[PDB]
Design a protein around this motif. Structure first.
Motif, PDB file in Angstrom:
ATOM      1  N   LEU B  58       0.829  -1.196   0.000  1.00 34.71           N
ATOM      2  CA  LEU B  58       0.000   0.000   0.000  1.00 34.71           C
ATOM      3  C   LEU B  58       0.866   1.250   0.000  1.00 34.71           C
ATOM      4  CD1 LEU B  58      -2.214  -2.224   0.674  1.00 34.71           C
ATOM      5  CD2 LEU B  58      -2.958  -0.750   2.537  1.00 34.71           C
ATOM      6  N   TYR B  59       2.085   1.151   0.531  1.00 35.37           N
ATOM      7  CA  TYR B  59       2.987   2.281   0.393  1.00 35.37           C
ATOM      8  C   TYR B  59       3.530   2.378  -1.023  1.00 35.37           C
ATOM      9  CZ  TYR B  59       5.605   6.113   2.326  1.00 35.37           C
ATOM     10  OH  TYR B  59       6.051   7.374   2.637  1.00 35.37           O
ATOM     11  N   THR B  60       3.591   1.259  -1.757  1.00 37.41           N
ATOM     12  CA  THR B  60       4.075   1.327  -3.135  1.00 37.41           C
ATOM     13  C   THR B  60       3.059   2.019  -4.027  1.00 37.41           C
ATOM     14  OG1 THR B  60       3.191  -0.870  -3.638  1.00 37.41           O
ATOM     15  CG2 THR B  60       5.482  -0.731  -2.974  1.00 37.41           C
ATOM     16  N   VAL B  61       1.781   1.647  -3.895  1.00 39.62           N
ATOM     17  CA  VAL B  61       0.749   2.347  -4.665  1.00 39.62           C
ATOM     18  C   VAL B  61       0.646   3.810  -4.226  1.00 39.62           C
ATOM     19  CG1 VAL B  61      -1.194   1.513  -3.222  1.00 39.62           C
ATOM     20  CG2 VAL B  61      -1.614   2.211  -5.582  1.00 39.62           C
ATOM     21  N   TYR B  62       0.863   4.086  -2.928  1.00 33.01           N
ATOM     22  CA  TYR B  62       0.866   5.455  -2.415  1.00 33.01           C
ATOM     23  C   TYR B  62       1.956   6.305  -3.068  1.00 33.01           C
ATOM     24  CZ  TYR B  62       0.211   9.032   1.286  1.00 33.01           C
ATOM     25  OH  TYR B  62      -0.045  10.183   1.992  1.00 33.01           O
ATOM     26  N   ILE B  63       3.188   5.791  -3.130  1.00 35.73           N
ATOM     27  CA  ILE B  63       4.280   6.574  -3.707  1.00 35.73           C
ATOM     28  C   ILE B  63       4.157   6.690  -5.233  1.00 35.73           C
ATOM     29  CG2 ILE B  63       5.765   6.073  -1.743  1.00 35.73           C
ATOM     30  CD1 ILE B  63       6.905   4.533  -4.802  1.00 35.73           C
ATOM     31  N   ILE B  64       3.701   5.634  -5.931  1.00 37.99           N
ATOM     32  CA  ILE B  64       3.592   5.730  -7.395  1.00 37.99           C
ATOM     33  C   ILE B  64       2.472   6.681  -7.808  1.00 37.99           C
ATOM     34  CG2 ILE B  64       3.267   4.452  -9.561  1.00 37.99           C
ATOM     35  CD1 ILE B  64       5.873   4.012  -8.216  1.00 37.99           C
ATOM     36  N   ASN B 153      -6.718  13.331   0.525  1.00 43.36           N
ATOM     37  CA  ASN B 153      -5.735  12.954  -0.489  1.00 43.36           C
ATOM     38  C   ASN B 153      -4.512  12.258   0.108  1.00 43.36           C
ATOM     39  OD1 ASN B 153      -5.974  13.033  -3.238  1.00 43.36           O
ATOM     40  ND2 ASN B 153      -4.780  14.914  -3.505  1.00 43.36           N
ATOM     41  N   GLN B 154      -4.015  12.737   1.244  1.00 44.08           N
ATOM     42  CA  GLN B 154      -2.790  12.215   1.843  1.00 44.08           C
ATOM     43  C   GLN B 154      -3.113  11.409   3.094  1.00 44.08           C
ATOM     44  OE1 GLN B 154       0.985  12.821   1.189  1.00 44.08           O
ATOM     45  NE2 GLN B 154      -0.113  12.538  -0.744  1.00 44.08           N
ATOM     46  N   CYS B 155      -2.541  10.213   3.202  1.00 39.15           N
ATOM     47  CA  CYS B 155      -2.798   9.330   4.339  1.00 39.15           C
ATOM     48  C   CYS B 155      -1.640   9.406   5.331  1.00 39.15           C
ATOM     49  CB  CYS B 155      -3.017   7.897   3.866  1.00 39.15           C
ATOM     50  SG  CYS B 155      -3.331   6.704   5.186  1.00 39.15           S
ATOM     51  N   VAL B 227      11.139  16.003  14.585  1.00 36.63           N
ATOM     52  CA  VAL B 227      11.399  17.272  13.899  1.00 36.63           C
ATOM     53  C   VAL B 227      10.111  17.863  13.321  1.00 36.63           C
ATOM     54  CG1 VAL B 227      12.649  18.322  11.965  1.00 36.63           C
ATOM     55  CG2 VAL B 227      13.798  16.717  13.469  1.00 36.63           C
ATOM     56  N   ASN B 228       9.269  17.012  12.718  1.00 32.72           N
ATOM     57  CA  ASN B 228       8.032  17.428  12.053  1.00 32.72           C
ATOM     58  C   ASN B 228       7.063  18.152  12.982  1.00 32.72           C
ATOM     59  OD1 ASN B 228       6.310  17.667   9.843  1.00 32.72           O
ATOM     60  ND2 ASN B 228       5.179  15.825  10.431  1.00 32.72           N
ATOM     61  N   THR B 229       6.862  17.634  14.201  1.00 26.33           N
ATOM     62  CA  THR B 229       5.893  18.242  15.110  1.00 26.33           C
ATOM     63  C   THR B 229       6.289  19.652  15.540  1.00 26.33           C
ATOM     64  OG1 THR B 229       4.560  17.894  17.086  1.00 26.33           O
ATOM     65  CG2 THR B 229       6.868  17.276  17.232  1.00 26.33           C
ATOM     66  N   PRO B 236      10.510  17.323   3.397  1.00 27.44           N
ATOM     67  CA  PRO B 236       9.782  17.060   2.155  1.00 27.44           C
ATOM     68  C   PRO B 236       9.404  15.592   2.063  1.00 27.44           C
ATOM     69  CG  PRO B 236      12.112  17.231   1.699  1.00 27.44           C
ATOM     70  CD  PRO B 236      11.949  17.535   3.163  1.00 27.44           C
ATOM     71  N   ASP B 237       8.255  15.348   1.421  1.00 24.83           N
ATOM     72  CA  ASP B 237       7.610  14.045   1.225  1.00 24.83           C
ATOM     73  C   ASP B 237       8.542  12.895   0.834  1.00 24.83           C
ATOM     74  OD1 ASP B 237       5.250  15.271   1.858  1.00 24.83           O
ATOM     75  OD2 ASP B 237       4.521  15.439  -0.202  1.00 24.83           O
ATOM     76  N   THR B 238       9.556  13.204   0.017  1.00 22.22           N
ATOM     77  CA  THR B 238      10.539  12.210  -0.415  1.00 22.22           C
ATOM     78  C   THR B 238      11.376  11.694   0.757  1.00 22.22           C
ATOM     79  OG1 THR B 238      10.622  13.225  -2.610  1.00 22.22           O
ATOM     80  CG2 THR B 238      12.501  11.874  -1.971  1.00 22.22           C
ATOM     81  N   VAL B 239      11.724  12.579   1.692  1.00 20.31           N
ATOM     82  CA  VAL B 239      12.492  12.179   2.867  1.00 20.31           C
ATOM     83  C   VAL B 239      11.631  11.319   3.789  1.00 20.31           C
ATOM     84  CG1 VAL B 239      13.724  13.116   4.864  1.00 20.31           C
ATOM     85  CG2 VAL B 239      14.013  14.159   2.640  1.00 20.31           C
ATOM     86  N   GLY B 243      12.465   7.444   5.082  1.00 18.69           N
ATOM     87  CA  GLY B 243      12.358   6.988   6.468  1.00 18.69           C
ATOM     88  C   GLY B 243      11.433   5.796   6.655  1.00 18.69           C
ATOM     89  N   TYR B 244      10.256   5.833   6.007  1.00 20.56           N
ATOM     90  CA  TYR B 244       9.312   4.720   6.134  1.00 20.56           C
ATOM     91  C   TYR B 244       9.830   3.469   5.441  1.00 20.56           C
ATOM     92  CZ  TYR B 244       4.837   6.883   7.635  1.00 20.56           C
ATOM     93  OH  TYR B 244       3.810   7.471   8.330  1.00 20.56           O
ATOM     94  N   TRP B 245      10.484   3.657   4.288  1.00 18.22           N
ATOM     95  CA  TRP B 245      10.981   2.515   3.538  1.00 18.22           C
ATOM     96  C   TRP B 245      12.069   1.805   4.316  1.00 18.22           C
ATOM     97  CZ3 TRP B 245       8.808  -0.664   0.612  1.00 18.22           C
ATOM     98  CH2 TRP B 245       7.859  -0.275  -0.336  1.00 18.22           C
TER      99      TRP B 245
HETATM  100  C1  LIG Z   1       2.990  13.574   9.159  1.00 12.96           C
HETATM  101  C2  LIG Z   1       3.171  13.378   7.683  1.00 12.96           C
HETATM  102  N1  LIG Z   1       2.944  14.463   6.946  1.00 12.96           N
HETATM  103  N2  LIG Z   1       3.027  14.407   5.621  1.00 12.96           N
HETATM  104  C3  LIG Z   1       3.336  13.249   5.025  1.00 12.96           C
HETATM  105  S1  LIG Z   1       3.436  13.070   3.302  1.00 12.96           S
HETATM  106  C4  LIG Z   1       3.829  11.397   3.473  1.00 12.96           C
HETATM  107  C5  LIG Z   1       4.006  10.634   2.214  1.00 12.96           C
HETATM  108  O1  LIG Z   1       4.787   9.687   2.160  1.00 12.96           O
HETATM  109  N3  LIG Z   1       3.262  11.029   1.180  1.00 12.96           N
HETATM  110  C6  LIG Z   1       3.202  10.278  -0.065  1.00 12.96           C
HETATM  111  C7  LIG Z   1       4.411  10.463  -0.946  1.00 12.96           C
HETATM  112  C8  LIG Z   1       4.566  11.597  -1.732  1.00 12.96           C
HETATM  113  C9  LIG Z   1       5.659  11.746  -2.566  1.00 12.96           C
HETATM  114  C10 LIG Z   1       6.618  10.747  -2.607  1.00 12.96           C
HETATM  115  S2  LIG Z   1       8.012  10.914  -3.673  1.00 12.96           S
HETATM  116  O2  LIG Z   1       7.973  12.199  -4.313  1.00 12.96           O
HETATM  117  O3  LIG Z   1       9.196  10.491  -2.981  1.00 12.96           O
HETATM  118  C11 LIG Z   1       7.795   9.690  -5.042  1.00 12.96           C
HETATM  119  F1  LIG Z   1       7.757  10.306  -6.214  1.00 12.96           F
HETATM  120  F2  LIG Z   1       6.668   9.012  -4.890  1.00 12.96           F
HETATM  121  F3  LIG Z   1       8.800   8.828  -5.058  1.00 12.96           F
HETATM  122  C12 LIG Z   1       6.492   9.612  -1.823  1.00 12.96           C
HETATM  123  C13 LIG Z   1       5.388   9.481  -1.002  1.00 12.96           C
HETATM  124  C14 LIG Z   1       3.888  10.971   4.796  1.00 12.96           C
HETATM  125  N4  LIG Z   1       4.179   9.700   5.143  1.00 12.96           N
HETATM  126  C15 LIG Z   1       3.599  12.058   5.716  1.00 12.96           C
HETATM  127  C16 LIG Z   1       3.515  12.135   7.129  1.00 12.96           C
HETATM  128  C17 LIG Z   1       3.797  10.973   8.054  1.00 12.96           C
END
Ligand SMILES: Cc1nnc2sc(C(=O)NCc3ccc(S(=O)(=O)C(F)(F)F)cc3)c(N)c2c1C
Ligand SMILES: C[N+](C)(C)CC#CCOC1=NOCC1
Lengths: 56, 274, 339, 225, 235
Positions: B58-64, B153-155, B227-229, B236-239, B243-245
Motif C-alpha cells: 500500500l505504500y508502493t501504490v501510495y508513492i507511485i 488525499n494524503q494518508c 522534527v516534524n511536530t 519534504p515528502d521524499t524524505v 524513512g518509512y521505507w
Molecule cells: C505527518 C506526515 N505528513 N506528511 C506526510 S506526506 C507522506 C508521504 O509519504 N506522502 C506520499 C508520498 C509523496 C511523494 C513521494 S516521492 O515524491 O518520494 C515519489 F515520487 F513518490 F517517489 C512519496 C510518497 C507521509 N508519510 C507524511 C507524514 C507521516
C-alpha cells in the motif's frame, strides 16, 4: 593353551559330523512355506479397513 | 521511470515474505529447531510477514500515485495495522534481548524457570502492548478533537502535529527500547567472555551487526517524526518516504541477522531451497 | 609341538567343513525363486505414533496378544503401551538408566530389562498391590547385557558382552546353563518357535546355533565382515537372518549349514541395527543407521519398500504375532506403528 | 465415543504423562559427566574428592548444582558398542597420571603408560559421538611427578623433548602434547587442571568448567554463537 | 495384605450430618479409583459415589447428588464420605470398593467390610435378576440369569457386566469381570456367558461355600446399577 585347542578341535569335530541336506531342497522348503502362508500375512496383502485394528 | 520502482519494491516485499515464510518452515519442518528460544523468532517472523505482505504494497501504490485514493477508512485501518505490527516487531526484539540477557547472565537457573507458558506470556504481552499503545489513539484521535484534520488525499496520522503525543509515542516505541537493548547487549558481550578469545569476538561481531541494523533502520524516521511536530514544512515528502521505507527494510533483513546466525537454520534453509 | 599340531588339525577340520558345505550347494536360492512373482511395492503408513519417551529408545518387544508392547529408553523408564489406543498402561522406573534390551513374557505377567549394569531385572506386572515390583535381579554376567528373551515364566535366556549366553531359572536366580564359544561380544539372540534352539550373533562376525537343554553349540555360521548387531529366526524355524555392520543382511539355513541369501545395496553403507520377518516370512524388515527401515523380498533380495518416518537411527523393530503391524522404535524418542 | 472404563484408562494415561514430564524436567536440570582414564591413573582419588562390576554411578551436589558422574572403567567389553550411550553428556572428565611417564605397562611389555593414555585420549577426543563435548583434563600425581623428574628425565618418554628436567617445563610439555592431540580445536574446548591434595579445588574447577560449557551451550541456543 | 477398614457409622437423627472414613492398607492407594456402595438391610447393593485416581473425576448417584461429598486424602491413604441432610432412606451398610482401570485390569476387585449407618425416624440402565431364590444341592450345576435393559456390548468389543457374590455375613466378592473373564483367587468352576442383553453365570459342581446372594452389575455407563440379587441356599 592345550585345553582351548583340544576344545576347539572337539567342537569342530561335532560340527563337521552333522547331517547336511542340499541347498536346493532347503530353498524349495522356504519357498513352499512362504507360499503356504501367503494369504495369512497382512503386511504382504493389505486387509480391509474394517479388518485392520489400527486403521479402524 | 515510475513503474520500475514498483517492480523493485515488489521484489523487496517478495524477499521479505519468502524469508519469513522460510523461517517459519525452518521451525516447523525441522524437529531440532523447535525450542523455547525459537518461539520468539517465530512471532517476529510473523510480524515481519505482515509488514512485508501488506504494509509495503500500500505504500508502493501510495508513492507511485502520489496521493492516497483508496479512502479514509482503509487509510486509518492501514495506519493502525502498520504501526501496531511494527511496534510488535520492536517489542519482539526487546524480549529477545531480555531472554538472551537472562540466559547468559544466569545460565544455571533461568532456562530452568523459562517455560513455554512464559514465552507465550511474553509474546502475548509484546503484541498486547503494541496494540494498546498504537491502535486506539490512531483510530480515535479525529473523534477526540471532533474533526479529521488529515486531508483525504494524503494518508498520515492526525496527532503527528501534537508535540506531547509524538514525544510520548517516540520515547515509548523507540528511544526507550533502543537504550534497553543497547545496555542489555553490551552486558551480554561482557558476560560472554570465558572467566575460566574467539567466542567473545564472534558474539561481539554478532551484537554489533544486529544493533547497527536496528539503529540504521528505525532511527531516521523516529528523528523525522520529532522534527516534524515542531517544524511541519521542514521535511519534504521524499524524505518521509525514505524513512518509512528504511523502517520496512528492517523487517526485510530481520531473518538474516537473527535466524541465519544459528547455522542449523542455514542448513534447513539451503535444504528447503533445493 | 602339541599346540601347533592341534592348530593344523583345526585347520584341516575347517577345510573339511568348507568342502562339505560346498558339496551340498547344487543351486542358489536366487536360481530357484527366479520364477516366482515379486511382491510388488509395499507402502506402509504410520498408523500410530507413541510419544512419551524423553531419550533414545534402545529396544521394544511386542506382547503375544499383539496389542501391548513394552519399550525401553535411556531416560530410565520402561513404558508398557496399548498400541490400539496409544494409552500408557504402565510406566516403570529403572534403577539403572543404561538399558539396552527389554523383553515381555509370553504369559504377559512379566517384563525384563537390562543393560550396562550387567543385571537382568524381572518385573512382575500382575501384583495384588496394583503397582509393578521388581520380582528378580539376575546377576552373574561380567559384561553389558545386550539381549534377553523369555522361554516361559520361570526361564530366561540372556546374551552379554562377556562373549557368553546364559539360561537362567528365575525363581532361584541361578544360571542353569552357560553357553560359551563366541570370541566377541554377543549382541543379540533369537529363540526358535519351539524354544528348543536359539541363535546368537556376536562381534566376531559369526552366528552360533545352541541347544537349550544340552547346552552346546550345534552349528557356526560365518560370512559377515563385521559385527552382527541383530538376528531373527525364520517362522518355520529352519532359517535365520542376520543384520550386520557391513551394510548387508544375510539369510542362513540350519539344515544346509550355510548362507542362502545376501540383502545389500550400493546406496546403503550404514549398518543394520534390527531385523525381523513378516508372519509368512516373505518380507524381511531391517532397520538401519540412515534413519530408515527397508523391506526386502526375502526370497528374491529386492528392496520391496521403505519405512521412512524417523529423525534419528532406527534402533529397534518388531512384528506382531498375528502379523498385523510393525513397530519401529528409534533414537528420536518415538515409536511408530506401521501397517 | 469412549466407554466409562476407556475414559478412566485415558485419565490414567494422562497422569502417567504428567509424572513422566516432571521426571524429565528434573533429569534435564542435572549435569552428566563421563569419567574416563587409564587404570590406576587417579580416577578413584578424583571420585573421593568429588563425593565429599558394571557402571559405577556417583552423585554429588555442589553450589546448588547436581552432578551425576559415570565411571565405566569396569567394562572390559568393546567400547564402540556402548560409547554412543553417552552422547549427550555435559563433559568428559579424563584422568591422566603424570607419574606414569616412565612406567611400562604391566599387561604389555615395552609399551609406555603415557603413550597408552595419549592413545586413549586421542580415541575419545576425536570420537564421532563427542565432536561438541568438552573435556576436563586432570593431570594427577604432580608431586610424585616432581620427585621423579629430578632423577628420571622426560626424554625416555618424549625423545624429541628439548627442555630441561625442571617440573614446570616438563608439565607444560605434557599438557601441550595432550592439547595438541585435539583435532577439532574449533568446536570443542579442553580444560586442564593439576591435582590438589585435599585443597578441594577440583570440585571448584569442575564447577567452573561446567559453568563455562553451559554458558557456551546457551549462547549456541540463543543464536549468538 | 490388601485391607479396607470403614468407620464412622452409628445412629444419626434425620436431617443431621455424619462423615464416613475408609482406611486403606497393603496396596498402592493413590493409583486406585474408589467407590462407595450402600446396602439397605433388607435390599441389595446400590452404588453411591466414585472418585477417580488423582481426584480428577467425581460421580454421584442421583439420590445423593448435592447432599453427599466424596473425597480422598492420598498421603494418609484415607477415603471420606461427608454426608449431610440424612434422610430415612440413607440407612444402610456402606462399603468402600477399590477399582483400577487400564487395559486388562479387573475393577471392583476388593471390598471393605462396611460400616452401619442407622437414621432414626430415567435413563438409567435397569438390570433384572428375575428369580430371587433358587434351591440347590451340592455337586449340581446351576445357572444364574441377568438381563439388561440396554445392550452392554460396546463398540470396542467389551461387554461391561460384572458378577459379585455376597456370602452370609460377609462383604461382596468379585467373581466375574467384563462378562467372560474370571477373577484372581476365584475357582475355575465359575463361568460367564452373555449375548448382549442376556447373561448367564454357570456354577458347575457347587460347593457349600457357594451359597449366598449373586449380583450382576453393569459398568457401561454411570450411574452403575446392580441387579436385585439371586439367592442360593442349601436343600
Ligand atoms: C505527518 C506526515 N505528513 N506528511 C506526510 S506526506 C507522506 C508521504 O509519504 N506522502 C506520499 C508520498 C509523496 C511523494 C513521494 S516521492 O515524491 O518520494 C515519489 F515520487 F513518490 F517517489 C512519496 C510518497 C507521509 N508519510 C507524511 C507524514 C507521516
Ligand atoms: C514508520 N512505519 C510506519 C513504516 C513503521 C512504524 C512504526 C511505529 O512503531 C515503531 N516506531 O519506532 C519503533 C516502533
Amino acid at each position: 593353551s592345550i585345553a582351548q585347542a583340544r576344545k576347539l578341535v572337539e567342537q569342530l569335530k561335532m560340527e563337521a559330523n552333522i547331517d547336511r541336506i542340499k541347498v536346493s531342497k532347503a530353498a524349495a522348503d522356504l519357498m513352499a512355506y512362504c507360499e503356504a502362508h501367503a494369504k495369512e500375512d497382512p503386511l504382504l496383502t493389505p486387509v480391509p479397513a474394517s479388518e485392520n485394528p489400527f486403521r479402524e | 521511470e515510475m513503474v520500475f520502482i514498483a517492480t523493485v519494491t515488489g521484489s523487496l516485499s517478495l524477499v521479505t515474505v519468502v524469508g519469513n515464510i522460510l523461517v517459519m518452515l525452518s521451525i516447523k519442518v525441522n524437529r531440532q529447531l523447535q525450542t523455547v528460544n525459537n518461539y520468539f523468532l517465530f512471532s517476529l517472523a510473523c510480524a515481519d510477514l505482515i509488514i512485508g505482505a501488506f504494509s509495503m504494497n500500500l505504500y508502493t501504490v501510495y508513492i507511485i500515485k502520489g496521493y492516497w485514493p483508496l479512502g479514509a477508512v482503509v487509510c486509518d485501518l492501514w495506519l493502525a495495522l502498520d504501526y501496531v505490527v511494527s511496534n510488535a516487531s520492536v517489542m519482539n526484539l526487546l524480549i529477545i534481548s531480555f531472554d538472551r540477557y537472562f540466559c547468559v547472565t544466569k545460565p544455571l537457573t533461568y532456562p530452568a524457570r523459562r517455560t513455554t507458558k512464559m514465552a507465550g506470556l511474553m509474546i502475548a504481552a509484546a503484541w498486547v502492548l503494541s496494540f494498546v499503545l498504537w491502535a486506539p489513539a490512531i483510530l480515535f484521535w479525529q473523534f477526540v478533537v471532533g474533526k479529521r484534520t488529515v486531508p483525504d488525499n494524503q494518508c498520515f496520522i492526525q496527532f503527528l502535529s501534537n508535540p506531547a503525543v509524538t514525544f510520548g509515542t517516540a520515547i515509548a516505541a523507540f528511544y526507550l527500547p533502543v537504550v534497553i537493548m543497547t545496555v542489555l547487549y553490551i552486558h551480554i558481550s561482557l558476560a560472554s567472555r570465558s572467566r575460566v578469545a574467539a567466542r567473545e569476538r564472534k558474539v561481539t561481531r554478532t551484537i554489533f551487526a544486529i544493533l547497527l541494523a536496528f539503529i540504521l533502520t528505525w532511527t531516521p524516521y523516529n528523528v523525522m517524526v520529532l522534527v516534524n511536530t515542531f517544524c511541519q514544512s521542514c521535511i519534504p515528502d521524499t524524505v518521509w518516504s525514505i524513512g518509512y521505507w528504511l523502517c520496512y527494510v528492517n523487517s526485510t533483513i530481520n531473518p538474516a541477522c537473527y535466524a541465519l546466525c544459528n547455522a542449523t537454520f542455514k542448513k534447513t534453509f539451503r535444504h528447503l531451497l533445493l | 609341538s602339541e599346540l601347533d599340531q592341534l592348530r593344523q588339525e583345526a585347520e584341516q577340520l575347517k577345510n573339511q567343513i568348507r568342502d562339505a558345505r560346498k558339496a551340498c550347494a547344487d543351486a542358489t536360492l536366487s536360481q530357484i525363486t527366479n520364477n516366482i512373482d515379486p511382491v510388488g511395492r509395499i507402502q506402509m503408513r504410520t498408523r500410530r505414533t507413541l510419544r512419551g519417551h524423553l531419550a533414545k529408545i534402545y529396544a521394544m518387544h511386542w506382547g503375544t496378544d499383539s496389542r501391548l508392547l513394552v519399550s525401553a529408553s535411556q531416560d530410565g523408564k520402561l513404558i508398557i503401551w496399548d498400541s490400539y489406543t496409544t494409552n500408557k498402561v504402565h510406566a516403570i522406573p529403572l534403577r539403572s538408566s543404561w538399558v539396552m534390551t527389554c523383553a515381555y513374557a509370553p504369559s504377559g505377567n512379566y517384563v525384563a530389562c537390562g543393560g550396562l549394569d550387567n543385571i537382568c531385572s524381572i518385573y512382575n506386572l500382575k501384583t495384588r498391590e496394583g503397582n509393578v515390583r521388581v520380582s528378580r535381579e539376575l546377576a552373574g554376567h561380567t559384561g553389558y547385557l545386550s539381549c534377553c528373551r523369555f522361554l516361559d515364566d520361570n526361564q530366561i535366556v540372556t546374551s552379554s558382552g562377556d562373549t557368553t549366553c546364559a539360561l537362567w531359572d528365575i525363581e532361584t536366580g541361578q544360571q542353569t546353563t552357560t553357553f560359551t564359544g563366541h570370541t566377541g561380544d554377543v549382541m543379540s539372540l533369537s529363540l526358535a518357535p519351539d524354544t528348543r534352539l536359539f541363535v546368537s550373533g556376536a562381534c566376531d562376525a559369526s552366528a552360533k546355533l545352541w541347544d537349550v537343554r544340552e547346552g552346546m553349540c550345534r552349528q557356526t555360521f560365518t560370512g559377515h565382515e563385521s559385527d552382527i548387531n541383530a538376528i531373527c529366526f525364520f517362522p518355520n524355524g529352519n532359517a535365520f537372518a542376520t543384520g550386520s555392520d557391513d551394510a548387508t543382511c544375510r539369510l542362513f539355513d540350519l539344515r544346509a549349514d550355510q548362507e542362502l541369501m545376501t540383502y545389500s545395496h550400493d546406496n546403503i553403507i550404514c549398518g543394520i541395527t534390527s531385523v525381523s520377518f513378516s508372519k509368512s516370512g516373505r518380507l524381511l524388515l531391517a532397520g538401519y543407521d540412515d534413519f530408515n527401515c527397508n523391506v526386502w523380498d526375502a526370497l528374491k533380495a529386492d528392496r520391496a519398500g521403505v519405512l521412512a518416518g524417523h529423525d534419528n537411527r532406527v534402533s529397534c523393530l518388531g512384528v506382531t504375532d498375528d502379523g498385523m503391524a510393525v513397530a519401529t522404535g528409534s533414537w528420536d524418542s518415538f515409536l511408530k506403528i506401521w501397517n | 465415543t469412549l466407554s466409562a472404563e476407556d475414559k478412566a484408562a485415558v485419565e490414567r494415561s494422562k497422569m502417567i504423562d504428567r509424572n513422566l514430564r516432571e521426571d524429565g524436567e528434573k533429569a534435564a536440570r542435572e549435569v552428566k559427566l563421563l569419567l574416563l582414564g587409564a587404570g590406576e591413573s587417579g580416577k578413584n582419588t578424583i571420585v573421593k574428592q568429588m563425593k565429599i562390576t558394571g557402571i559405577v554411578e556417583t552423585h554429588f551436589t555442589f553450589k546448588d548444582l547436581h552432578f551425576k558422574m559415570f565411571d565405566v572403567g569396569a567394562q572390559r567389553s568393546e567400547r564402540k558398542k556402548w560409547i554412543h550411550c553417552f552422547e549427550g553428556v555435559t563433559a568428559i572428565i579424563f584422568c591422566v597420571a603424570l607419574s606414569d611417564y616412565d612406567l611400562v605397562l604391566a599387561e604389555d611389555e615395552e609399551m609406555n603408560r603415557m603413550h597408552a593414555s595419549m592413545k586413549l585420549f586421542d580415541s575419545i577426543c576425536n570420537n564421532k559421538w563427542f565432536t561438541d563435548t568438552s573435556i576436563i583434563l586432570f593431570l594427577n600425581k604432580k608431586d610424585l611427578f616432581e620427585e621423579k623428574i629430578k632423577k628420571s628425565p622426560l626424554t625416555i618418554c618424549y625423545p624429541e623433548y628439548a627442555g630441561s628436567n625442571t617440573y614446570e617445563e616438563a608439565a607444560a610439555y605434557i599438557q601441550c602434547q595432550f592439547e595438541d592431540l585435539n583435532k577439532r580445536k574449533d568446536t570443542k574446548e579442553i580444560y586442564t587442571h593439576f591435582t590438589c591434595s585435599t585443597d578441594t579445588k577440583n570440585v571448584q574447577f569442575v564447577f567452573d568448567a561446567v559453568t563455562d560449557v553451559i554458558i557456551k551451550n546457551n549462547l549456541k541456543d540463543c543464536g549468538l554463537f | 495384605d490388601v485391607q479396607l477398614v470403614e468407620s464412622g457409622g452409628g445412629l444419626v437423627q434425620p436431617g443431621g450430618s455424619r462423615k464416613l472414613s475408609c482406611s486403606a492398607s497393603g496396596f498402592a492407594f493413590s493409583s486406585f479409583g474408589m467407590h462407595w456402595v450402600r446396602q439397605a438391610p433388607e435390599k441389595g447393593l446400590e452404588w453411591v459415589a466414585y472418585i477417580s485416581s488423582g481426584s480428577g473425576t467425581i460421580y454421584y448417584a442421583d439420590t445423593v447428588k448435592g447432599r453427599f461429598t466424596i473425597s480422598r486424602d492420598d498421603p494418609k491413604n484415607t477415603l471420606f464420605l461427608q454426608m449431610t441432610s440424612l434422610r430415612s432412606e440413607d440407612t444402610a451398610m456402606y462399603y468402600c470398593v477399590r477399582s483400577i482401570y487400564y487395559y486388562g485390569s479387573s475393577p471392583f476387585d476388593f471390598w471393605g467390610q462396611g460400616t452401619t449407618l442407622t437414621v432414626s425416624s430415567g435413563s438409567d440402565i435397569v438390570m433384572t435378576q428375575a428369580t430371587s431364590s433358587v434351591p440347590v444341592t451340592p455337586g449340581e450345576s446351576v445357572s444364574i440369569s441377568c438381563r439388561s435393559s440396554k445392550s452392554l456390548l460396546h463398540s470396542n468389543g467389551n461387554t461391561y457386566l460384572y458378577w459379585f457374590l455376597q456370602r452370609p455375613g460377609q462383604s461382596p466378592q468379585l467373581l466375574i469381570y467384563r462378562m467372560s473373564n474370571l477373577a484372581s483367587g476365584v475357582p475355575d468352576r465359575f463361568s460367564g456367558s452373555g449375548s448382549g442383553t442376556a447373561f448367564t453365570l454357570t456354577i458347575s459342581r457347587l460347593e457349600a461355600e457357594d451359597v449366598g446372594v449373586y449380583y450382576c452389575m453393569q459398568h457401561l455407563e454411570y450411574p452403575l446399577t446392580f441387579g436385585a440379587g439371586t439367592k442360593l441356599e442349601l436343600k
